[PDB]
Symmetry: C2
Subunit: 245 residues, 2 copies
């Protein structure tokens, strides 16, 4: 379990400020959320993003397509029960129609928690994201490093920065979302568990693993980096090389 001086260095060179640029100018899920926010109540918008995140696994389509499908469905839609809306949404969806019973059960669980929260409580959770993290681990009964829990924090942070008009960095303590592709890329580097491997990279670089996640994913896909400054693009090309793609 060797570390990586070169990954630390490039990620440090990019910085949280670089990850923020990628998140807001490249990440297509962010843009889907920007659209829904313009067509939804702010409080409901944030809660829907939490609920959606909790069922964004074993999809029947591309993740980006799924988040756009969510954004179109809830745009201009009055939601009373989040649980009842997903009951109608998922079975008729293109991109998420497997394991609907299990996923609806998950939304049922979180729905209680969310019913207790005001918009000010959510602004509170944005200002203190480890608290949300811990509260989601509680209500869902999942591991600290559960890919779906940490992804839900990440997406909550996207929604909040849109809704609350300010950027707050993710906590260093929240691990990277370890889905199959992140395991795959990481395994080319090490046999160490990705969440542990990338926590150390994050700690040493000063860039939280949830912001590191934002740097990696465009490089795994088909990203348009032209919104970014030449210096940032150059660093991302170096990162691409160091990851072996």
């Amino acid at each position: 379990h060797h570390g990586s001086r070169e990954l630390v260095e490039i990620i440090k060179g990019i910085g949280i400020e670089g990850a923020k640029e990628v998140e807001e100018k490249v990440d297509r899920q962010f843009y889907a959320l920007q659209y829904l926010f313009r067509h939804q109540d702010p409080e409901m918008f944030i809660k829907l993003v939490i609920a959606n995140s909790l069922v964004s696994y074993q999809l029947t389509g591309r993740g980006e397509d799924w988040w756009w499908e969510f954004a179109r469905y809830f745009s201009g839609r009055e939601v009373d029960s989040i649980w009842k809306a997903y009951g109608e949404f998922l079975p008729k969806s293109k991109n998420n129609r497997r394991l609907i019973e299990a996923k609806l059960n998950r939304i049922r669980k979180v729905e209680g928690f969310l019913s207790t929260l005001t918009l000010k409580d959510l602004e509170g959770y944005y200002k203190n994201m480890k608290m949300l993290w811990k509260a989601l681990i509680k209500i869902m009964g999942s591991r600290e490093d559960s890919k779906t829990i940490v992804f839900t924090v990440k997406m909550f942070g996207y929604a909040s920065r849109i809704a609350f008009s300010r950027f707050i960095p993710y906590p260093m303590e929240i691990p990277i979302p370890e889905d199959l592709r992140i395991k795959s890329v990481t395994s080319k580097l090490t046999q160490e568990k990705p969440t542990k491997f990338w926590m150390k990279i994050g700690q040493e670089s000063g860039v939280p693993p949830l912001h590191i996640d934002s740097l990696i994913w465009p490089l795994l896909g088909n990203a348009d980096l032209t919104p970014l400054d030449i210096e940032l693009r150059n660093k991302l090309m170096k990162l691409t090389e160091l990851l072996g793609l």
Copy 2:
């Protein structure tokens, strides 16, 4: 046939293209979150008025603008551009003339409050005429009509309300649009597309939004299936 497809997409389809796919709209949504509303709109007007004879792609230019003004205090827009353009990647050409144009519009903008801007959003033909007057341009100037178009974007974001562009404002007529139009007609794009608009009920500045994603092999995956299907038939017709 072109009329029928465009009528089918409609202003509402144009709106979704603008708001989900258009890369300038994306850039402005970014800048809006990092500026105060009144300065945001004013910056967009001034920028548009110097968005000609670029030294890069238009979309790259709008991102470069967004990046430059993100979180930036602006005391004089004219002063800010005197710093910005000479060091720019994508607009390092005809800087003296462009700075002169910003000097001219800055005087007009300085008179305007956020409420005055919202009134120009409600009367976009008044803004068009106003900019032709202060800038000394043509009615079918690409740069002037595209300035009203981007002002519309900025205003939609800042005021959270949609008002369709006026039917009278012509399409921005550059070399790319002349290429497309010449496969369809010999008439001047500005005239042809005005007629296409009256007949389809879709103002020409909204029609502009339909063509460019198609020109540029844009990703239409954000859009509803039915709209994406209408756009693919448009792509065939236009070639």
